[PDB]
């Protein structure tokens, strides 16, 4: 948990990407490599292609996802089972 007198974290490029995707009105999935950024209430409903080191997985922002970070919806380890 970040300290409260720091504010939440979002990258400059992701936040300006979010603003230009809102101002442009277009709602395709856009990609970022920034898993460390907090989701925000202006980003609801749009798709974020989040990097998991290999791929860009599409994340659909919900009401329930708001305060969290972006990496929690892109699992970077693939495990099915041993036996």
């Amino acid at each position: 948990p970040r300290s409260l007198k720091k504010g939440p974290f979002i990258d400059l490029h992701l936040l300006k990407k979010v603003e230009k995707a809102v101002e442009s009105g277009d709602k395709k999935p856009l990609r970022t490599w920034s898993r460390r950024s907090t989701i925000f209430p202006n980003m609801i409903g749009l798709t974020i292609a989040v990097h998991n080191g290999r791929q860009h997985v599409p994340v659909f922002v919900t009401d329930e996802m708001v305060g969290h970070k972006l990496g929690e919806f892109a699992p970077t380890r693939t495990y099915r089972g041993h036996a």
Partner: protein, 114 residues
Amino acid sequence: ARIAGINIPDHKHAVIALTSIYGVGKTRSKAILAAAGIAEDVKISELSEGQIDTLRDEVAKFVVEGDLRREISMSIKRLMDLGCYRGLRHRRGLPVRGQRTKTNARTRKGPRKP
């Protein structure tokens, strides 16, 4: 001899009997007895009913037994249908706080069958 959900034991002291409630531990019972005014080294056999109904409202001050199991269960449920990392670890049955999954975690992944 009975608070919001359950029976508290009667021969035990006030804070020790008060921890038998779900949602009330040690500091909660210290604050409950401090707000009530009863000295904690009395027994529920020693104590009458007016003190324990002023205890009843003061433990209604806190989210306790039934709706607390409701809150914890719903919070795990919201994480589990959310599909995040901690929810998915709650789903497979593994540690969620970054413990070592290599050797240990028989509390989480259960007693060692195979």
